[PDB]
Amino acid sequence: GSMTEYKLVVVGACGVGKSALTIQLIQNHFVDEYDPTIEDSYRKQVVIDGETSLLDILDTAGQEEYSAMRDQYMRTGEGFLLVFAINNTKSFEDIHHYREQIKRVKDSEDVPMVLVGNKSDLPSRTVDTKQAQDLARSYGIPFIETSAKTRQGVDDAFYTLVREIRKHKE
Ligand SMILES: *CCC(=O)N1CCN2Cc3cc(C#C)c(-c4c(O)cccc4Cl)c(F)c3OC[C@H]2C1
Ligand SMILES: Nc1nc2c(ncn2[C@@H]2O[C@H](COP(=O)(O)OP(=O)(O)O)[C@@H](O)[C@H]2O)c(=O)[nH]1
Ligand SMILES: [Mg+2]
């Protein structure tokens, strides 16, 4: 029957859990060693607020920043997940650079994004919840705490981005 296809892109520094968040959503698996240069897309059909949704998720990786292939996925991308790790201060600081780069390639100021603080299962936190929420408010986007290990917030992160895209359409 009726459904909506959503083109999603996951971006963030090395080792934050981009690949782990994608594989956890798609096949309920926590991957320990996913090759950091492997940049693949994964499809998943899910019901979100009683609407059938076809998620198409690009997991960015260690490849050239400005190849025709990445430009194509960035230009077609409808929503962005801005991922940092809550035990990695530099990955959180880097969120500023990624948001502006997304705005620049999308040539717009209203691009649907969600801020995702991943590895929420780790005690050795260095980015407190308040700091992340401050950053999220400064950009007018929601913030979701997630763990690819425990599955906490994984569904919520992707489903919230879908809701953000819905708002942007109307
Ligand atoms: C460990 C390797 C890995 O997972 N990577 C490599 C580093 N990369 C950083 C990154 C940088 C930029 C930039 C500039 C973008 C990007 C590009 O290339 C074009 C348009 C918009 C944006 Cl945000 C990017 F997507 C990434 O992805 C994260 C990360 C992945
Ligand atoms: N404890 C914990 N480890 C994680 C989590 N997400 C990813 N990792 C680990 O961090 C490492 C880097 O993950 P990966 O998904 O490859 O990061 P990427 O470079 O952003 O794609 C891997 O060993 C993962 O098992 C998480 O939520 N909790
Ligand atoms: Mg990866």
Author numbering: -1 to 168
Q: What does the article say, verbatim?
A:
We describe the construction of a cross-docking database comprising 100 examples generated from 10 structurally diverse KRASG12C inhibitors with known X-ray crystal structures (3 of which are newly solved for this data set) and describe a method of incorporating receptor flexibility into CovDock to produce a docking protocol we refer to as FlexCovDock. To further benchmark the performance of FlexCovDock, we collected ten co-crystal structures of structurally diverse ligands demonstrating conformationally diverse switch-II pocket poses. We then docked each ligand into every receptor structure, leading to a set of 100 docking simulations (10 self-docking and 90 cross-docking). As shown, superposition of the ten receptor structures from the cross-docking data set reveals dramatically differing backbone and side chain conformations for the switch-II loop residues (Ala59–Tyr64). The adjacent α2-helix (Ser65–Thr74) likewise demonstrates significant conformational shifts across this set of X-ray structures. This conformational flexibility results in markedly different ligand–receptor interactions in differing X-ray structures. Further highlighting the high conformational mobility of the switch-II loop, it should be noted that switch-II loop conformation can be significantly influenced by crystal packing interactions. Ligand–receptor interactions can differ substantially between different copies of the same binding site within a single crystallographic unit cell.
